[PDB]
Amino acid sequence: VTSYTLSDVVSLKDVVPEWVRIGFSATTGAEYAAHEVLSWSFHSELSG
Amino acid sequence: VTSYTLSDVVSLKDVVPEWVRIGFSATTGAEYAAHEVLSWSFHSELSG
Amino acid sequence: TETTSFLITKFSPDQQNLIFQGDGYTTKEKLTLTKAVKNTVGRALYSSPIHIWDRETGNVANFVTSFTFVINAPNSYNVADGFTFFIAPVDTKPQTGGGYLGVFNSAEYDKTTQTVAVEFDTFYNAAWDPSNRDRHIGIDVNSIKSVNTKSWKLQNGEEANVVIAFNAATNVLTVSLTYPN
Amino acid sequence: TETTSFLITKFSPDQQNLIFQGDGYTTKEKLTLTKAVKNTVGRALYSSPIHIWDRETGNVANFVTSFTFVINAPNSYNVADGFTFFIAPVDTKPQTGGGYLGVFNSAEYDKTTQTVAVEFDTFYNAAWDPSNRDRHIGIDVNSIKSVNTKSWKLQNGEEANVVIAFNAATNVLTVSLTYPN
Numbered sequence A, B: 001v002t003s004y005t006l007s008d009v010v011s012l013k014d015v016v017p018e019w020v021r022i023g024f025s026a027t028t029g030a031e032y033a034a035h036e037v038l039s040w041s042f043h044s045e046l047s048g
Numbered sequence C, D: 001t002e003t004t005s006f007l008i009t010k011f012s013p014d015q016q017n018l019i020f021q022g023d024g025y026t027t028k029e030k031l032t033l034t035k036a037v038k039n040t041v042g043r044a045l046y047s048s049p050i051h052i053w054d055r056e057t058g059n060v061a062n063f064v065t066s067f068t069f070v071i072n073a074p075n076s077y078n079v080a081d082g083f084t085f086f087i088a089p090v091d092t093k094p095q096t097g098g099g100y101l102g103v104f105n106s107a108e109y110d111k112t113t114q115t116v117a118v119e120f121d122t123f124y125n126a127a128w129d130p131s132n133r134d135r136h137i138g139i140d141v142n143s144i145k146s147v148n149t150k151s152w153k154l155q156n157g158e159e160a161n162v163v164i165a166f167n168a169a170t171n172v173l174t175v176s177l178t179y180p181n
């Protein structure tokens, strides 16, 4: 079991629009690799 | 409290496509009324 | 396994996760399908397609939905036509208006409609509604002529809590409506 | 209150609740962003727009996403460029490819991009990546040059489990990637 964690402060409200779309992206250039996703779950809660 | 209940057997598989959109509809004719929705929650689970 | 869920207790003026058709739009924290005007139609759909059944496995989804709706008529006796919750193809568009509720085109069974709806019918259309003339809750399958109905007493301007559930193990669709009093 | 959730443990050949861009497509129960070919880009987005913050109240949403991804390279020395999970404007198309990972167009802060991304970078781009040249996880804000990074040792062909969570109370974005061995 090998884990890696990273954290930082991001003021979402100042960066993204009120409504957004979420997703994945992957690219290759002069060098490459296959990029795959096997499963995905998402949950968001906006109170008020 | 006044409650009404109704149920019936509907074989969805034979009626709707595999992928669908859900929603509300309302109409008026010679007679009318405002139709409003104040809250809405939904949850579906397809085993696989 | 594939699940889809959402909850909206307050509607925003520009509700981007909804698709509007006809005169549907959001105002004052609520979703307005129609106003108290004549000859109109309004629909609102969740933007994301829902995976209801799978041909590969043959599995069918279980689902439950809850919503609170209000019908406000000028007169508690001059009301029409009604409201529905429906399941239809991804590219669904408004159908016939008036007593057809914007979801069907005939009383005759039409397999190509591919639409299942639970109606909250407030106006008696002699050609297909229950002969007792009562306003009613009905389960519609590819037709405006309900497969089963239950008499319902409309409470003008009062909030109604609805729960519609489908059990894939039995293919049973249940509808329940409740008024605060 | 507004919540949005979904779960997909296995993808279908016709995943209609996803939007595919570039080389993106589903097959063999998996979501393929790119095959092992040069100079290409692939993206996949959830169909429904998400309400991440509220203009009226100033409230911001808490959210959590978890996924399992795999990178299959021809070898362990020549790998590029990487993969990201991102949050962007509703109607977004693929941005610059290569080291820009299809979500940014420069290493300088561009407020119009309005995009936050968590990158899993496999190729050292001299102009902006950490001088140690290690592969790394990074948090990107309107720029390909991360605000923070963490050296990451890639396990070719292995399943990486990722959890990304955002705490609205503290504005902290946390990322964790776990390999079983």
Ligand SMILES: CO[C@H]1O[C@H](CO)[C@@H](O)[C@H](O)[C@H]1O
Binding pocket: A028, A029, A030, A031, A032, D080, D081, D097, D098, D099, D100, D123, D125
């Ligand atoms: C040699 O540089 C090229 O290939 C690398 C690796 O694929 C990309 O990061 C970069 O954008 C592209 O210009």
Ligand SMILES: CO[C@H]1O[C@H](CO)[C@@H](O)[C@H](O)[C@H]1O
Binding pocket: B028, B029, B030, B031, B032, C080, C081, C097, C098, C099, C100, C123, C125
């Ligand atoms: C008088 O008939 C008209 O008005 C009623 C009630 O509004 C609708 O049911 C019907 O379709 C329309 O043709």
Ligand SMILES: [Ca+2]
Binding pocket: C081, C099, C121, C122, C123, C124, C125, C129
């Ligand atoms: Ca009727």
Ligand SMILES: [Ca+2]
Binding pocket: D081, D099, D121, D122, D123, D124, D125, D129
């Ligand atoms: Ca890089």
Ligand SMILES: [Mn+2]
Binding pocket: C119, C121, C128, C129, C130, C138, C144, C146
């Ligand atoms: Mn009826």
Ligand SMILES: [Mn+2]
Binding pocket: D119, D121, D129, D130, D136, D138, D144, D146
């Ligand atoms: Mn980087």
